[PDB]
């Protein structure tokens, strides 16, 4: 309307050559500005492939893909999951959220105090690299800061790279499609400068937030879910929101926007621009197929949507979701009902504020909130039908009838949270650990996919995944044999590279050359605050597995002929990989 002028013009200028206006574009909730012609931008780890021969016949592994940066996919994901708008909740609900979000910010700001982020802090985090080392780049930033301080935005533009899509089905919760947003690195230092304190100071850490899990490693999440289960109450609920990022309302954004009321002076002016000029009023570049197999880049805008692809995407999403789960708790406890949806009587409004103040600190500790992922153990199973405020906030549950009672789990070991479920297994020496578990077919498939184009880079990435399995998924019979086999087939002095997971709970303790038995012992015994007897483990043969029955359910191939042949001919596979990579220092870990 007014704030997006500076960015549209700069775009028209840069590509005035092939710039044209309005092919029969399909945008409905996005104001169309124009398009321009561009080069379209539309991968197997041999080592893991060689060590996982039985899984060559498994469709879920061989047919795996979740990447789509292709212009065709960019249009597909934008139309169905980005070109969509959630209706605003009625006046009553909006008011209930107001009280709830107010209480939460106060609770987050009880001890921690906000702060601007620094240039050195940004650079320290990165280790693009050859960009931050150029002082010439930082002048461009300095100009933009003054534009923000002036109340204008010039270069901060989102680019819709592609789609992330989980093939629905058996092993994991069917996550819908999501859009992948990348931006100019300069825009990343900004926003981080203004709002990075939420992440860097762990504002939504479990200590500070009570319900969140920011900073907790994926190995910690299991125990956390157990503490929740340890509390008195009904069944444990974990309802997924149907396309969370797509159903963030303007009402919620305003409540999230209450950060500004916690900032002083120049800090607020920098952040005010980020939220209003960059978050609220967006400008997005997206590819689109046209003519005779040619691809153009569209430029569009939208003003009442947060969506995704920001530095605090996780931080805010965690926050709002907590507030949401609190509201649902209130409906479930009888504080509020369907009558107060349209208009909230003050008589009830007070009961809300009283509830948050008195019970909020306890209720929040019955939660496990990591972004859109949520697990809640309410007082009673009345929670299952408390949907009136939930559906009103447009946080409609996925894969269920709009008004069908929610599904709860009696066994916390079956509760899905952050792409895993969590099993408690008893070690050989009598002690017990709570380990993460997930579809093995998915795990091996993701190991098979290499983004690079280099043997060492491939073999290090293979050793990367392998050593991850030893630390987290050692309890899976196939994965432990395959990891030890891969490590044994990769030069012992080679340092793991690349990333094995995108989950924010993946710390990367395995990205080392250290003996993983030490690292395991470090993570699961020494630093594991739920392990009282700190007695170290001597060897892997003391490190427990899950039950066979449980393992096969979760995708194991044990007790099959094809795997059995593979396990006893594992050495042949190792000797091949060694012979291909070449003369280096190898170690036999298969003992
Ligand atoms: Zn800007
Ligand atoms: Zn499992």
Q: Specify which residues 397 forms β-bridges with.
A: 241
DSSP string, 326-350: HHHHHHHHTSS-GGGTTS--HHHHH
379 close to 235: Cβ distance less than 8 angstroms: no
Ligand 1 centroid from CA 22, angstroms: 26
For residue 164, what are its two tokens?
């992330």
Going from the Cα of 529 to the center of ligand 2, the distance in angstroms, rounded, reads 24
CA–CA gap between residue 501 and residue 443 (Å, rounded): 10
Per-residue CA distances from 516 to 221, 441, 468, 470 (Å): 21, 23, 9, 7
Q: Are strands 282-290 and 294-302 parallel, antiparallel or unpaired?
A: antiparallel
Single out the residue of 210, 293, 281, 282 nearest to residue 37, CA to CA: 293
452, 429 Cβ separation under 8 angstroms: no
Ligand nearest to the CA of 272: 1
Instruction: Check whether 33 is labelled as a binding-site residue.
Output: no
Say how many Å lie between the CA of residue 399 and the centre of ligand 2: 21
Q: Where are the domains of the chain?
A: 1-41+71-84+154-161+280-303, 42-70+419-591, 85-116+196-279+304-418, 117-153+162-195
CATH fold, domain 1-41+71-84+154-161+280-303, is: Alpha-Beta Plaits (3.30.70)
Cα(230)–Cα(233) distance, integer angstroms: 9
Identify which of 375, 114, 363, 100 has the alpha carbon closest to the alpha carbon of residue 252: 100
E strands in 153-249: 158-164, 178-182, 236-237
DSSP code per residue over 444-494: HHHHHB-----HHHHHHHHHHHHHHHHHHSTTSHHHHHHHHHHHHTS-TTP
Q: Is 487 annotated as a binding residue?
A: no
CA distances from 348 to 66, 268, 344, 354, 380 (A): 47, 34, 7, 10, 21
Give me ligand 2 centre to Cα 421, in Å.
6
Report which bound ligand comes closest to the CA of 555.
2
Q: What CA–CA distances, in Å, run from 97 to 89, 170, 297, 322, 336? A: 10, 35, 39, 11, 12
Inter-residue contact 335 to 352 (CB < 8 Å): yes
Whats the size of the chain, residue-wise?
A: 591
437 is in an annotated binding site: yes
Closest of 550, 469, 557 to residue 55, by C-alpha: 557
Is residue 156 part of an annotated ligand binding site? yes
Our CA dihedral for 374, 379, 382, 384, rounded to 10 degrees, sits at: 20
CB 282 within 8 A of CB 158: yes
Cα–Cα distance for residue pair 547/475, rounded to 1 Å: 9
Using alpha carbons only, give the angle 17, 18, 20 rounded to the nearest 5 degrees. Answer: 115
Report d(CA 89, CA 327) in Å as an integer.
Answer: 13
> C-alpha angle with apex 208: 202 to 213, nearest 5 degrees?
65
CB-based contacts of 294: which residues, under 8 Å, 6+ apart? Answer: 37
User: Would you say 554 is a known binding-site residue?
Assistant: yes
**What's the 194 CA to ligand 1 centre distance in angstroms?**
12
Q: How many angstroms separate the alpha carbon of residue 398 from the centre of ligand 1?
A: 35
Count the Cβ atoms, other than its own, within 10 Å of residue 581.
19
Q: How far apart are the CA of 5 and the centre of ligand 1, in A? A: 12
Residue 374 assigned ligand-binding role: no
In this structure, how many other beta carbons lie within 10 angstroms of the beta carbon of residue 206?
Answer: 20
Q: Which DSSP category does 89 fall into? A: P
Q: Which ligand is nearest to the CA of 423?
A: 2
d(CA 165, ligand 2 centre) in Å: 20
3-state secondary structure (DSSP) of residue 511: coil
Resolution expressed in Å = 3.7
Give all strands of the β-sheet with 408-409 in edge-to-edge order: 367-370, 373-376, 236-237, 408-409
Instruction: Measure the CA–CA gap between 434 and 130, rounded to whole angstroms.
Output: 42
Closest by CA to 349, choosing from 99, 42, 30, is 99
412 CA to centre of ligand 2 in angstroms: 13
Ligand 2 centroid, distance to 480 Cα (angstroms)? 15
User: What is the C-alpha separation between 63 and 72, in angstroms, rounded?
Assistant: 19
Q: How many CB atoms lie within 10 A of CB 18?
A: 11
CA of 402 to the centre of ligand 2 (A): 28
Tally Cβ neighbours within 10 Å of residue 281.
19
Burial of residue 265, with CB atoms counted within 10 A of its CB: 0-12 exposed, 13-18 middle, 19 or more buried:
exposed
Q: Phi/psi zone of residue 472: left (φ > 0), alpha (ψ -120 to 50 degrees), beta?
A: alpha
What's the CA-to-centroid distance between 284 and ligand 1, angstroms?
13
Give the C-alpha distances (Å, rounded to integers) separating 465 from 200, 472, 496. Answer: 27, 11, 9
Q: Which residues contact 42 (CB under 8 A, 6 or more apart)?
A: 69, 70, 71, 72, 73, 295
Q: In degrees rounded to 5, what are phi and psi of residue 476?
A: -100, 115
């Amino acid at each position: 309307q007014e704030k997006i002028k500076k960015r549209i013009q700069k775009l028209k200028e840069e590509f005035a050559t092939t710039w044209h206006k309005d092919p029969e574009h399909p945008y409905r909730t996005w104001t169309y500005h124009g398009s321009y012609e561009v080069k379209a931008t539309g991968l197997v780890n041999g080592v893991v492939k060689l060590m996982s021969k039985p899984w060559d016949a498994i469709a879920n592994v061989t047919t795996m893909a979740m990447t789509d940066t292709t212009p065709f996919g960019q249009q597909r994901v934008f139309k169905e999951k980005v070109d969509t708008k959630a209706p605003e909740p009625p006046a009553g609900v909006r008011e209930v959220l107001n009280e709830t979000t107010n209480w939460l910010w106060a609770h987050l700001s009880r001890e921690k105090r906000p702060r601007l982020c620094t240039k050195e802090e940004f650079i320290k985090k990165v280790n693009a690299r050859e960009a931050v080392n150029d002082p010439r780049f930082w002048e461009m930033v300095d100009e933009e800061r003054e534009n923000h301080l002036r109340g204008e935005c010039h270069t901060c533009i989102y680019n819709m790279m592609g789609k992330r899509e989980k093939k629905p089905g058996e092993f994991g919760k069917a996550k819908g499609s999501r859009a992948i947003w990348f931006m100019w690195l300069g825009a990343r230092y900004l926003e981080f400068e203004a709002l990075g304190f939420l992440n860097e100071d762990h504002w939504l850490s479990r200590e500070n937030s009570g319900g969140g899990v920011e900073g907790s490693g994926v190995q910690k999440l299991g125990y956390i879910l157990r503490d929740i289960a340890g509390k008195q109450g009904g069944k444990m609920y974990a309802d997924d929101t149907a396309g969370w990022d797509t159903r963030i309302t303007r009402t919620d954004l305003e409540n999230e926007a209450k950060v500004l009321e916690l900032l002083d002076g120049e800090h607020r002016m920098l952040a005010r621009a980020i939220i209003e000029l960059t978050y609220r009023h967006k400008v997005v570049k997206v590819m689109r197929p046209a003519a005779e197999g040619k691809t153009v880049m569209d430029v569009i805008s939208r003003e009442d949507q947060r969506g995704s692809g920001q530095v605090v995407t996780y931080a805010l999403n965690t926050f709002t979701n907590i507030a949401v789960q609190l509201v649902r708790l209130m409906e479930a406890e009888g504080v509020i009902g369907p009558q107060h949806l349209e208009q909230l009587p003050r008589k009830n409004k007070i009961a809300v504020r009283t509830w948050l103040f008195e019970n909020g600190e306890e209720r929040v500790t019955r939660m496990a909130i990591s972004g859109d992922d949520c697990v809640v153990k309410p007082l009673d199973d009345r929670f299952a039908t408390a949907l009136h405020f939930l559906n009103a906030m447009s946080k409609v549950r996925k894969d269920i009838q709009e008004w069908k009672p929610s599904h709860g789990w009696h066994d916390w070991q079956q509760v899905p949270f952050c792409s895993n479920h969590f099993q408690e297994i008893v070690m050989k020496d009598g002690r017990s650990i709570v380990v993460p578990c997930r579809g093995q077919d998915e795990l091996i498939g993701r190991a098979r996919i290499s983004p690079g184009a280099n043997v060492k880079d491939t073999a290090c990435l293979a050793k990367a995944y392998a050593q991850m399995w030893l630390l987290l998924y050692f309890h899976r019979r196939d994965l432990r044999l395959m990891a030890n086999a891969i490590c044994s087939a990769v030069p012992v002095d080679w340092v793991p590279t690349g990333r094995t997971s995108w989950s924010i709970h993946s710390k990367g303790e395995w990205m080392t050359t250290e003996d993983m038995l030490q690292v395991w012992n470090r993570v699961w015994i020494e630093e594991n605050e739920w392990m009282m007897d700190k007695t170290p483990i001597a060897s892997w043969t003391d490190v427990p597995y899950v039950g066979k029955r449980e393992d096969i359910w979760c995708g194991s191939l044990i007790g099959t002929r094809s795997r059995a042949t593979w396990a006893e001919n594992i050495y042949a596979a190792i000797n091949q990989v060694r012979a291909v990579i070449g003369k280096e220092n190898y170690v036999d870990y298969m003992t």
